[PDB]
Amino acid sequence: SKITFPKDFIWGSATAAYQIEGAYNEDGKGESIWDRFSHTPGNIADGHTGDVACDHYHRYEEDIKIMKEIGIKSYRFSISWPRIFPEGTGKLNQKGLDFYKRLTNLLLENGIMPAITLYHWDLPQKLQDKGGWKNRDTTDYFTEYSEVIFKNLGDIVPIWFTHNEPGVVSLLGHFLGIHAPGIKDLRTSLEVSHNLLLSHGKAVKLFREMNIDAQIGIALNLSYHYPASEKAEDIEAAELSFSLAGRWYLDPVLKGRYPENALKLYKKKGIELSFPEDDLKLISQPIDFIAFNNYSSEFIKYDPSSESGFSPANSILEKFEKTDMGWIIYPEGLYDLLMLLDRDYGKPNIVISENGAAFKDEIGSNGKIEDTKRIQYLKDYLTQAHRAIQDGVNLKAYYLWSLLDNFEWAYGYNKRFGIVHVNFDTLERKIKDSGYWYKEVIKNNGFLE
Amino acid sequence: SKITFPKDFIWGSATAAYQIEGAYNEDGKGESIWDRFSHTPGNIADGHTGDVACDHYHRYEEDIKIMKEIGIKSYRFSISWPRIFPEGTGKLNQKGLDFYKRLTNLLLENGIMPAITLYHWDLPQKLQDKGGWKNRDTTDYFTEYSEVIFKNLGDIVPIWFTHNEPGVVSLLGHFLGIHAPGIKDLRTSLEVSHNLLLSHGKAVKLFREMNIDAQIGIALNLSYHYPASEKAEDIEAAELSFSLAGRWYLDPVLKGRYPENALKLYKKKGIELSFPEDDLKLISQPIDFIAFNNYSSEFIKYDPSSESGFSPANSILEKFEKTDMGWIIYPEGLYDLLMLLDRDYGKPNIVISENGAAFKDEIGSNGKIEDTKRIQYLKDYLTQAHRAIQDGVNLKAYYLWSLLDNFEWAYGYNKRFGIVHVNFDTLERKIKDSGYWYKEVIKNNGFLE
Amino acid sequence: SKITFPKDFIWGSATAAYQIEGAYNEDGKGESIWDRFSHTPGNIADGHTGDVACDHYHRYEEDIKIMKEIGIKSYRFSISWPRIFPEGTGKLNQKGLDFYKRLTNLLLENGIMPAITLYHWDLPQKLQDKGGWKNRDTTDYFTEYSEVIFKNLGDIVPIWFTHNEPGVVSLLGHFLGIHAPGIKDLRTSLEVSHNLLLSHGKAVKLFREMNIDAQIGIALNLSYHYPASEKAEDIEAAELSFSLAGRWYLDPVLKGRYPENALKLYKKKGIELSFPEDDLKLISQPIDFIAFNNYSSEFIKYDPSSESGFSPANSILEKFEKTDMGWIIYPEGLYDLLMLLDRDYGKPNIVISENGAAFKDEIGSNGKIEDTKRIQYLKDYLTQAHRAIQDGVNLKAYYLWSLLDNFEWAYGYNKRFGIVHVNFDTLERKIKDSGYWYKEVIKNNGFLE
């Protein structure tokens, strides 16, 4: 049985700015919280940095020539705020604009469709010195930068993402402090979460004011949260996890509310926050699709000693193959999620900003990367992607994470999500077999499962 | 006739901390009443000590590898209080927690299910300088150390024991003074018995407050006490024994009372003392199972000689084969006991925390320990264990005392309960034939008697 | 059930130049490595040679009249390089050209479709004096000769084969040394394998630079390699055997890469060789079809004793009927292979350059060769050929090895794969019953199996 996606279905591959671009202090780019976080011992694996990375900034021509060789119909990327405004507000750095302008015009001229992400974590370090996302003034400055991009690139770019995974930014970056800007306070973490969503709201409101002939959305970190057992205590423990995690951002967008069962968990520890009612009507602002990033699924159990009230069910996850990240493989966990978004939020247009996997890659004696596991992963998860479309889901796009091997944040360059192998000493690209697989999948518009 | 145990039946082997661990002054471990007692002439056979013993502290990786090679489904061990709190209370020794945390995680990552005893006789010597278990305060401090263990290892460890054989600790350690701490006063011996039970009651109460997803119990020394003859004076004499011995700790924990016939014999010697009624409702606290340690059975006659009005029956006992300890072999004694725990105390869940036997082992010319008498002993007693389960008993677990040859207290190293021989000069393990037997008995889930 | 092939299905029979032509030093023909290898004691059975053979060079008229009598729709034959260039390069021998030019025109005029192989092992002996296929210059000279054949015979000949069984040439000719040119060195044997594939590339590249209105390909020696048992060691042993054997030529040509699991085996003996990257893109050069030569199948087990890591599973093979070659008869082992080529190389067009069998033939008292076993063999393998086409395989052609009895290399004339008997004293052709059977199979376009 050979499977075929809708004839209009946009195939793509995704990257971030800091994870590929390099040139961290070139052409008047301001310092970001990631430049800062990376240059401090104990933050990044092996002391790695995003100083050079894939050096896309100089080698983008080579990349596009690879992107077209595989024949992706859409290339999802991020704009570095600190290349546009070094100081986050005020003096425009025209050199930065003209990089991304030029890049987008090469894409449109190589018959590839641009898909920008406006914030992919690289907040200008100057704003971090005035409180960063905790300072509500940042949400205004994010709109200013948004404005300038829309004036230049508005009409000609069809697919916009305001934010990438605000879930992680606030959780890792502002509570656990293992991501930039390295802060560790729960209260701040929630005040940033709001201030992120608000900034999304302002950017969509501006997007409409300026009347850009293109589609906007938000890229959220999302998994399915299964209960450990079909018991009243576990099913509830899992509902709470999803609410803290993904639903905390899904409901304020889409439903104009925060999840209750999560809010009750915060106030049971002596944290309440008066959301201004008018902000939630600005966050809920209609959007042309919902985008998300999926890799794995969570299996939550009851735990009345974990101050959360729950924990991972280590008895159940030790039955799966686990990827190089230590995340389970479970392809049907994508289907169920796509059906959960379809059900609970009124059959919206869905995009997948990011799916993909990290396995240990080698270049063999044949000078090739035969990453059969990545390919196996890919087609397993894309079969469930198709299954969902057949059972009614409005899944318009799939973007593969990632196009190149890149900087994986606090893991450094010790993790490869690329379909194009990158040697971080020579910056030489060797298109993986998962890359040659994908080329055919785009051509045939599917594969024989 | 081939016997097969319930399909859910957990097979296990047991050890204690002082008896195997060694490293008696390493990584900030505080001195224990046993370290102190062992260092004094006239207390241990041949001036033996724990100090080194099996050196399990360092060689645990080797020991797990053997445990898995035999393929026990549960390892019952003891946590050293004086590794956790060198001064009983106050400054936490994180080194000692990290040992047991690591050890448990090596068991869970091999085949093996952990079973933790919280007090196997190694009271920090500091608390003994403020009276020890005579000072009621110690019962609180036990709860403090219990709390720290539950926070770390609470729900990932399924089976918990509060105490090991408080019957011996009070009798031998605080009246006969042949165990540590070497005290010889009758009043003190009863005040400790209480204080020990109370401490169990406080740990179970705290266990519930924290709401740990695991099962807690208490490991009692228990034999059957047969009358010498089927006569009114000898049946009564035997009831009074058992009541001084085992029932003194069974009735408080499961019936919330002290045995009357025993209490009457105390008061006939001019001792009462008012147990606070509220304590014995704290002791009685419901528990998930009763555990016990059995080896032999007692044959009591009536005796107006002996201040207890009873004695052993010398030459009924001189009709049995005897172990190397001088204890009779009588397998059917275990059945009757299991039936006595079942009938009285309301068909509880039963665990065997310890059963085994000590015979004079040699390494033969073939470099092997052919301990046919330990194997014979074992299978004999395990036929009467099975026979009880068939006649309705709820015996969920068997733990074989002991996994390793170890420090047998006042007898020193002169007595071997191990499957797995240990040379106490070289610290070389040689799995005994009783070991290899047990391996198969686990695998088949039984044996043809 | 009567089976019928596609209406467009091209039925053929095949011969080679050295095996049938004779006239080994006539009309200016240069000496070949097979002339040379044949004239040396110890190489060919019974001291046979191909000096005369079938003497097709003179008697081709008779042979075409036979070919048409049976009514084959295509005749696959080989061009002797040494007849075209006696010295490999330089002075053209017009006499040689005119032979093959004449031959091809007699085939077209008798309504038979030509199918030319360009190299079927007869490398001019002068090039073998400058190193032969080990000297890369040979790969350029091959292209010169390929150029002169295309100029003359390009358009009018529909089906072209660059090489026959380079697998055997390198393995048997250059490692085992039991074929010409008799060399015995492993390193050399791989350097020749590459150089051969390179020459194939150069010939296609030239075939496309001139835009000859005809379909080119390569004829590879291919079996199916079953694992002795459905076990991880034996599945893996078989994959390595197929990799060393056929896949070593399939992958370069159809995937532009050498098999990894094979390359690893070679480096583990201390042999790595840097193939220039550009050569493998030249080898991969798209081709109209893949042709292959099957007779039998292999059954490989795991073997650490063999430095290869595997060995033949004689225990299994000794359960089949065997040809006169000793090779097993296993019809289904064609089906599985046609599916393997279909699956693993993107459903290409497939030809069968050769299939057939050798059995001991006699001329009976009736002056006829009733070779029922060869007819049985044929119809058993053709039923599975059909089966594969039904189950979706793009098998366009079947060429029966061989039209005539001929010189079977090291075996001499001691083996008969003909459907036309040839007395090698008189050179008299007696069409075999297999020949008369095939004639009806072509007419009916099938048979009731």
Curated annotation (Swiss-Prot), chains A, B, C:
Instruction: Could you list this entry's UniProt keywords, alphabetically sorted.
Output: Carbohydrate metabolism, Cellulose degradation, Glycosidase, Hydrolase, Polysaccharide degradation
Catalyzed reactions per annotation:
Hydrolysis of terminal, non-reducing beta-D-glucosyl residues with release of beta-D-glucose
Enzyme active site: 165, 354
One of the GO BP terms on file: cellulose catabolic process
Query: Carries keyword Ubl conjugation?
Result: no
Example of a GO cellular component annotation carried by this entry: cytosol
Q: PROSITE patterns of this UniProt entry?
A: GLYCOSYL_HYDROL_F1_1, GLYCOSYL_HYDROL_F1_2
Q: Where is the signal peptide?
A: none
Q: Which EC number applies?
A: 3.2.1.21
This protein's pathway reads:
Glycan metabolism; cellulose degradation
The answer to whether UniProt assigns keyword Hydrolase to this entry is yes
Q: Which GO MF terms does the UniProt record name?
A: beta-glucosidase activity
Q: Give the first-level EC class, as a single word.
A: hydrolase
Q: Which Pfam families match?
A: Glyco_hydro_1
Task: Cite the NCBIfam families for this sequence.
Answer: BGL (TIGR03356)
The entry assigns this protein to a family as follows:
Belongs to the glycosyl hydrolase 1 family.
PANTHER family to which the protein is assigned, alphabetical: GLYCOSYL HYDROLASE (PTHR10353), LP05116P (PTHR10353:SF36)
**What is the designated name of this protein?**
Beta-glucosidase A
Q: Which gene encodes it?
A: bglA
